[PDB]
């Protein structure tokens, strides 16, 4: 096993409600939460997973806790509606992981972005060299629609790592009909 803390960053914006990505996009990101919580059950249960959004608020309803059955109950009535702010999402998740219990856990975090965010590349490079001085690899999986080939988050992937800490893997969004498990099959292959 391995000691880390992955903060699932769901999108509750008003773009995640249609059915281009499979029979609900809510169900698409919900199956994503299913596979990451089962994956951290298959990982070390000493690790912890908590919920957070980037849109409409920074909503903490569960603590970053090693249980996730209550998170599976928190899957329901997510009601995705609001306006995206992922640039506060990185920092709010990072302070949530500076509110942890142990330092031997690593910090490999995922993120789900599904809307056009007003994110300057200077904003996310402040965040990115901040994470260079905060030791966090982030594996973002693009959902929804902002661009068919995301660039700002590609720039964050570029500006997070160098030569040793290349733990930034960006599944850009396939904005046409692509499956529910074919999106998350590549990070469960390689995060």
């Amino acid at each position: 096993m391995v000691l880390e803390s992955t903060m699932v960053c769901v999108d509750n914006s008003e773009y995640m409600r249609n059915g281009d990505f499979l029979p609900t996009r809510l169900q698409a990101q919900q199956d994503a939460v299913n596979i990451v919580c089962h994956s951290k059950t298959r990982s070390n249960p000493e690790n912890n997973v908590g919920l957070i959004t980037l849109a409409n608020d920074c909503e903490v309803l569960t603590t970053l806790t090693p249980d996730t059955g209550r998170i599976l109950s928190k899957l329901h009535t997510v009601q995705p509606k609001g306006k995206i702010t992922f640039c506060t999402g990185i920092r709010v998740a990072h302070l949530a992981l500076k509110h942890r219990q142990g330092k031997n856990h690593k910090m490999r975090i995922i993120a789900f972005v599904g809307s056009p965010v007003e994110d300057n590349e200077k904003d996310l490079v402040k965040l990115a060299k901040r994470l260079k001085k905060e030791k966090v690899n982030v594996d973002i999986i693009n959902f929804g629609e902002e661009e068919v080939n995301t660039e700002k988050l590609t720039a964050f992937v570029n500006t997070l790592n160098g030569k040793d800490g290349t733990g930034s893997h960006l599944v850009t969004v396939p904005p046409g009909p692509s499956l529910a498990d074919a999106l998350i099959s590549s990070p469960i292959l390689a995060g």
Binding site: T62, R91, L95, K98, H99
Partner: protein, 286 residues
Amino acid sequence: AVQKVVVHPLVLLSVVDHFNRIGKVGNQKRVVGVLLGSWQKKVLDVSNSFAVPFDEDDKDDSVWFLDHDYLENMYGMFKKVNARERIVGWYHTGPKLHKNDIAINELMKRYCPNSVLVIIDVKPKDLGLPTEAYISVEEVHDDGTPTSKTFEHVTSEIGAEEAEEVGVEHLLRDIKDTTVGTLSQRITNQVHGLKGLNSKLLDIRSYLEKVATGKLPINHQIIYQLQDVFNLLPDVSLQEFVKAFYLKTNDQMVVVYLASLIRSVVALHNLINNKIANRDAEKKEG
């Protein structure tokens, strides 16, 4: 929705100890902890409370953290060991509120639909009573804005409970009990004259804020109307109380009659025993 509060000093000391818990570590802004309560009438009571960890960066005042699992756990603890209590709000130690506090309020108004905060001061010198109460209701606006969700200043006090001062008045030890008859009245004179007319002069400094500034809510709804409740006495020169000098003489009347009669009887008290025992001691001293 809230009539007033009855708040014991014990919960304030329960704020003080967690202030001691945070003064030794890296203190970014302040304390945010749970305020339990004993809500019975539209009046309010608090017997006890406890805290919760909290940090807050200042970039978009939205990054702020509690632990609702820990909160409900120790709530279940103190609810089991005392079924009288329940949560009633929160508190903060920095005496000036900020814009994140509405997010704090509405994020904890989900357990019970009211969550009254408590401003306190760990270093109070100039204020009156530390305890303060807001409530989050809407009047929506005169211009009817999209949800002008306003804290509304509910009245407050320090509460009272039998035999909770057993520690307190034994500890402080310095109390001059029942100074009626000496200088308490002039302490109230100095402080109410100066420290209330400076509130008045800072109200007129806020009026100068309305002069040079103050377009914001300039507030021609409640200000002059409660100031008209003041303006029940427009006390301009020539003093206008020809119809009250005789009433003031009537005020002087009975008390000076008591003074004359009674203090003549007080001289009559002193002189008798003073003369008798005086010359007793004097010419029976030898």
